[PDB]
Write a protein that holds these residues in place. Structure first.
Motif, PDB file in Angstrom:
ATOM      1  N   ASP B   8      30.479  47.183  25.382  1.00 48.52           N
ATOM      2  CA  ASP B   8      30.260  46.494  24.124  1.00 48.52           C
ATOM      3  C   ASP B   8      31.265  46.950  23.071  1.00 48.52           C
ATOM      4  N   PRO B  45      38.434  43.828  28.498  1.00 45.30           N
ATOM      5  CA  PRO B  45      38.957  43.684  29.865  1.00 45.30           C
ATOM      6  C   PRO B  45      39.287  44.994  30.616  1.00 45.30           C
ATOM      7  N   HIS B  77      39.091  33.690  23.769  1.00 39.31           N
ATOM      8  CA  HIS B  77      39.728  33.014  24.900  1.00 39.31           C
ATOM      9  C   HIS B  77      40.722  33.947  25.600  1.00 39.31           C
ATOM     10  N   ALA B  79      40.407  37.296  25.593  1.00 40.05           N
ATOM     11  CA  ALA B  79      39.515  38.272  26.210  1.00 40.05           C
ATOM     12  C   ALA B  79      38.832  37.744  27.479  1.00 40.05           C
ATOM     13  N   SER B  80      38.338  36.505  27.427  1.00 38.45           N
ATOM     14  CA  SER B  80      37.695  35.849  28.568  1.00 38.45           C
ATOM     15  C   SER B  80      38.611  35.753  29.779  1.00 38.45           C
ATOM     16  N   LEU B  81      39.891  35.477  29.509  1.00 31.82           N
ATOM     17  CA  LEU B  81      40.916  35.429  30.545  1.00 31.82           C
ATOM     18  C   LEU B  81      41.140  36.788  31.189  1.00 31.82           C
ATOM     19  N   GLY B  82      41.268  37.829  30.365  1.00 28.97           N
ATOM     20  CA  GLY B  82      41.340  39.195  30.852  1.00 28.97           C
ATOM     21  C   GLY B  82      40.153  39.525  31.736  1.00 28.97           C
ATOM     22  N   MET B  84      38.286  37.496  33.476  1.00 29.57           N
ATOM     23  CA  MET B  84      38.413  36.774  34.725  1.00 29.57           C
ATOM     24  C   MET B  84      39.474  37.401  35.619  1.00 29.57           C
ATOM     25  N   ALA B  86      40.408  40.619  35.497  1.00 33.40           N
ATOM     26  CA  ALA B  86      39.802  41.889  35.918  1.00 33.40           C
ATOM     27  C   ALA B  86      38.868  41.726  37.121  1.00 33.40           C
ATOM     28  N   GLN B  87      38.088  40.645  37.123  1.00 38.00           N
ATOM     29  CA  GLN B  87      37.201  40.318  38.234  1.00 38.00           C
ATOM     30  C   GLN B  87      37.932  39.957  39.512  1.00 38.00           C
ATOM     31  N   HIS B  93      31.824  40.982  39.987  1.00 37.33           N
ATOM     32  CA  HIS B  93      31.477  40.138  38.847  1.00 37.33           C
ATOM     33  C   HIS B  93      31.501  40.919  37.553  1.00 37.33           C
ATOM     34  N   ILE B  94      31.900  40.231  36.487  1.00 40.74           N
ATOM     35  CA  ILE B  94      31.685  40.675  35.121  1.00 40.74           C
ATOM     36  C   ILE B  94      30.928  39.540  34.461  1.00 40.74           C
ATOM     37  N   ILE B  95      29.731  39.802  33.958  1.00 42.54           N
ATOM     38  CA  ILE B  95      29.044  38.740  33.232  1.00 42.54           C
ATOM     39  C   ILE B  95      29.427  38.803  31.756  1.00 42.54           C
ATOM     40  N   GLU B  96      30.125  37.767  31.309  1.00 39.89           N
ATOM     41  CA  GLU B  96      30.535  37.631  29.917  1.00 39.89           C
ATOM     42  C   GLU B  96      29.351  37.243  29.049  1.00 39.89           C
ATOM     43  N   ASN B 124      20.071  37.690  34.922  1.00 37.64           N
ATOM     44  CA  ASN B 124      21.030  37.150  35.891  1.00 37.64           C
ATOM     45  C   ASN B 124      21.708  38.230  36.703  1.00 37.64           C
TER      46      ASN B 124
END
Lengths: 140, 141, 141, 152, 152
Positions: B8, B45, B77, B79-82, B84, B86-87, B93-96, B124
């Motif tokens: 976090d 990430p 956007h 960060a979300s790419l990083g 993905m 990283a996964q 899995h990384i749950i965003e 989840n």
């Protein structure tokens, strides 16, 4: 510990000197290595080289995007580059990007970029040495 | 046994990590938990990848509350790419858990939404760990 | 041969069941493996894990993106993940994304998702067994 | 000796492959040529890379015809990144032959444009493979594939 | 260091390589230079990477000129990430020299702008190779390539 600091000649404000000074204040004997590159798009490889070849535990990436639409795309490209450099070396790069956009004039911009560089410098310190403090501060 | 890593930020205005840990420990009290906090969303990430690859986390939760500006959407956007990337570099899995500022009408709603979302993603994570075929029952539909 | 089928809980039509039916129709002894993930952002790693850890020859990624600009940005991140997942494992993943954007009403939405799952399932069959039928159909006719 | 991969789609409204192959074979009667057809533009990158790494292709032509919609343009951009990553992971060229439907007026022009683009790109393939220094003669010369050259 | 690669295109409407080459030899007379020309800007990333990995270049200059349309804008963005990725895969700089056609008001300006940006970036390469402490001296100053220095 070793911190790498990568800045640019493009930037219209020196953020490095205040980052260094903040780091030395907080941990007097901490090791610093500085590299300077032409532009923001040159930042990712230089940061990575510093992480993989100069023993840096962490790097600060200092940039100042221009005002244009093209500069916003450049910074986004460079941002992504930094993210990739980090995933390739399981090591942090704190992106210290101050857009010219973010200040109302030159004098404010000078003050703002320097205050941001100082603050991220504090964070680098906390990530290195006091990572329980950042947890205590989890979201306000 | 199972290990969940929880990453976090200091920048976010709701503590979602507490919401999710608690949820996680009630559904499965023997799950292992390692926490890491980073200044901002763009530092998520690597920290997630580190927890995955260096601390033996089976899965990670990445928590953040992006701002409302057009420049906050790009950072998120980014960060979300990083996340993905990283996964895919770790077959894990990384749950965003990104709760944007505009997703609620005021502060009171935003806090409730972030609380709800952190809890739901923790659910989840539990299913993915212990009953993967329970997500299938509710597939599509 | 073995096909991986990855869908979501978030989606609003069962596309997986429709892809599986067509597939076992065209090739009775194709092996099928399913995995359900909560959301579209969780698709790529699931796809990659199936390809690399489960011996899947090809995978179908199934999702139903929303209408919002936020949903479109998410879907785009998802598609790039799927594209990177395919390059890291020299294996195809067939994307079946049906944006709510593409139909008027749910009636047509339901039907279009169904039809797409089917025609793509056929393409998967072709890639696997009759790749020279695709060449016959290159450039349409 | 010398092998070219050609990857096209069923989605395409025009057959670009037959032009490119005919151009390659007339430029070099003995070149080895490998064809693979995929449904769509998003399927191009893995198909291209497989051709480079598994079939011993020296270079690949990725042939694609994106639709008019803004959604189509997003996918084209996705395929283009994919192509670029495939090349980097296997230090080999993939020549992106993408013809948007936006680029022509009517179908007659779409047919003409896609075929000429594919053909001019086939020649560039010949050049990268056999006479790269010719491209150096043409540095800064405002060369266009499809429509007429811009010039310096 | 000893070796520089220069990658340019036939698409570009101004020859950017000659001026960069001249600058380089002027600053370091014995410098080794290697040139490859590709058709387009999207072909730059792999050519750049091969020069770094297979021709033993210490650094590369990637020279291109994006067109005016919002589609050439996407091509250059695609090409720029490619360049960044090629740099991160090697631990080696690629200096991106892109001159968009929208930046000049006529062709005379564009010839001028492209040549100047090339030269100044060529000077940046010199420093990166030989005098990297000087770039630290100019850290946070007004420096621009092509257009006049913005100043601190």
């Amino acid at each position: 510990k070793k911190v790498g600091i990568v800045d640019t000649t493009f930037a219209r404000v020196d953020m490095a000197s205040i980052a260094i000074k903040k780091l030395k204040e907080l941990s007097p004997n901490i090791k610093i290595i500085r590299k300077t590159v032409p532009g923001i798009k040159d930042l990712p490889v230089a940061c990575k080289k510093l992480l993989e070849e100069e023993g840096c535990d962490i790097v600060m990436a200092l940039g100042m995007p221009g005002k244009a639409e093209k500069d916003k795309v450049c910074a986004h490209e460079a941002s992504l580059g930094l993210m990739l450099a980090q995933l390739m070396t399981n090591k942090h790069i704190i992106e210290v990007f101050v857009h010219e956009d973010e200040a109302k004039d030159d004098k404010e911009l000078d003050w703002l970029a320097k205050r941001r560089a100082e603050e991220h410098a504090e964070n680098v310190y906390y990530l290195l040495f006091k990572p329980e403090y950042l947890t205590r501060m989890a979201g306000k």
